[PDB]
Design a protein around this ligand. Structure first.
Ligand SMILES: *C(=O)/C=C\c1ccc(O)cc1
Length: 125
């Protein structure tokens, strides 16, 4: 288990040194999106929550194909705004319900230390 807490203020610095292998050790879901919403990373933990096979969704558009239930002003709206503005740090509850049992979750989104990469952290509530 990779000892990193959900909601840590310096999470993006800590996660900068993790490979996909290390990323699977987190106690929470972690997805890495590019500026266009394509999945660059998607760890085992999130997969436990959504049922998705991590290595299968990589390279696919999240908002378009993986998780259409996040295609809303309440989720997709903030991401694109964050991307545009060049910064993002927001926390809010949500419910994933596409092709799965409705699961109330907490979502944390924040720009990565990298230029055009963005994190989506997910935990059960
Ligand atoms: C809403 O988000 C529904 C499903 C879903 C699919 C994939 C991932 O990663 C999260 C949620």
């Amino acid at each position: 288990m990779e000892h990193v807490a959900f909601g840590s203020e310096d999470i993006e610095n800590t996660l900068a040194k993790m490979d996909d292998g290390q990323l699977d050790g987190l106690a929470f879901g972690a997805i890495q999106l590019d500026g266009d919403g394509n999945i660059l990373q998607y760890n085992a933990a999130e997969g436990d929550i959504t049922g998705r096979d991590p290595k299968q969704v990589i390279g696919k558009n999240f908002f378009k194909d993986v998780a259409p239930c996040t295609d809303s002003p309440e989720f997709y709206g903030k991401f694109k705004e964050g991307v545009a503005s060049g910064n993002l740090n927001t926390m809010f509850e949500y419910t994933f319900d596409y092709q799965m049992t409705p699961t109330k979750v907490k979502v944390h989104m924040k720009k990565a230390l990298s230029g055009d990469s963005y994190w989506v952290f997910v935990k059960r509530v």
